[PDB]
Amino acid sequence: VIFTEEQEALVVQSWNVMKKNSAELGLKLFLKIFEIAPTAKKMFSFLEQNQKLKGHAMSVFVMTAKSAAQLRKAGKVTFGESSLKHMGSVHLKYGVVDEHFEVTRFALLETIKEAVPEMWSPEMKNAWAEAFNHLVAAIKAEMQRLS
Amino acid sequence: IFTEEQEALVVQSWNVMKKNSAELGLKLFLKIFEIAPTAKKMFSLEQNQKLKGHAMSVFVMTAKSAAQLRKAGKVTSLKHMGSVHLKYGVVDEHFEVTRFALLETIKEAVPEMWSPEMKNAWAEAFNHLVAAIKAEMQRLST
Ligand code: HEM
Ligand code: HEM
């Protein structure tokens, strides 16, 4: 797929600003997830500032920004050895459905809009959205590859 | 149990929203399909649609619940509600996304009045209504 250099810079530069507040931005991300769909808590076996709840939210942030660089360099999302199968196996094992990915995307954009209020743009969201969509498509491709 | 103070919060706020109920229905499903676009697959062009009339039902049946929960203590068609939602696979995630979008339409849309008790009033009225729908949804083989 095609991913312009401006879309890459929008994600990289905005993530460079959010790197220091990534911990607090992780808790707020899951606060909106658990506010929109509280049943999402059941998939996580882990009091209110839970470290693996932030560490998972950390991953959603950092892997999405890393995805934007791959979409510009090669045009696809590439995972490493024993990593693509792990992503698919875990999300499949806990029954992550499309609604969970799409609520997380909505909450992610809401956490990127309230973090940097003066960087966001109708072009900024599409950069983070496509980077998040291609990342989910790769996770879902390995989940649907258990034939 | 549903206190009289919680009833007044819903009844009075809905009286203001009665005139804008039509547009408030489209706004409810616009946020639903924005948060979880896969919800469209459960339904069947979509400018003005019967999805607004369906969203009308979500609005009007929730307001009816607040009056019923205060008058009698229960939500009072029920067999049809459970049967339809069961056949299309409406899960808990769908009910709570609709609740979030509903509350965003009751506090952030055109009704500009809000309170820590106002949201909880519509939330409990929506929960007891959904609990009754879900009680009839568990009328499957298990
Ligand atoms: C682009 C989106 C996502 C990415 C990049 C991502 C990434 C990850 C990573 C790195 C792990 C850790 C695996 C391990 O440590 O073995 C994980 C586990 C997990 N993820 Fe995701 N995830 C995403 C979306 C989601 C969504 C939407 C849900 C559901 C709300 C979800 C639920 C889980 C669960 C339940 C686990 C396992 C936690 C545990 O082992 O206790 N993930 N994910
Ligand atoms: C929360 C997520 C919900 C989803 C995803 C959902 C979905 C659906 C779907 C797909 C139908 C079938 C429509 C048709 O085939 O014509 C339906 C029917 C209906 N829904 Fe819901 N529903 C939800 C909640 C509610 C709530 C809270 C109410 C109000 C109490 C409600 C009121 C109705 C009514 C009255 C019908 C009857 C339609 C008919 O008889 O043709 N729904 N719903």
Author numbering:
A (entry chain A): 7 to 52, 60 to 160
B (entry chain B): 8 to 51, 60 to 91, 96 to 161
Sentences from the paper on this structure:
Phytoglobins (Pgbs) are plant-originating heme proteins of the globin superfamily with varying degrees of hexacoordination. Pgbs have a conserved cysteine residue, the role of which is poorly understood. Class 1 Pgbs are distinguished by a weak hexacoordination (KH ≈ 2) compared to Class 2 Pgbs (KH ≈ 100). Due to the very high O2 avidity of Class 1 Pgbs, these proteins generate a tight and slow binding of O2 well suited for O2-dependent nitric oxide (NO) scavenging in low O2-containing environments.
In this comparative study, we investigated the role of Cys86 in BvPgb1.2 by generating an alanine-substituted mutant. The imposed substitution did not affect the overall tertiary structure, but led to significantly faster autoxidation rates and a minor increase in thermal stability. However, the overall 3D structures were very similar. The main differences can be found in the helical arrangement of the F-helix. In the WT, this helix starts with a Glu residue, while, in the mutant, the helix seems shorter and starts two positions downstream with a Ser residue. As a result, the direction of the side-chains has different orientations as clearly observed in the proximal His, which is almost in a perpendicular position compared to the proximal His in the WT. In helix E, where the mutation was located, no apparent differences could be observed compared to the helix E in the WT. Even though this possibility cannot be dismissed for BvPgb1.2, it is evident that the substituted cysteine did not contribute to increased monomer content. The redox balance is altered when the cysteine is removed, reducing the ability of the heme to stay in its active ferrous form. Thus, since the oxidative state of Cys86Ala is pushed toward the inactive ferric state, fewer radicals are formed in the reaction with the peroxide, ultimately leading to less activation of the possible substrates in the peroxidase reaction.
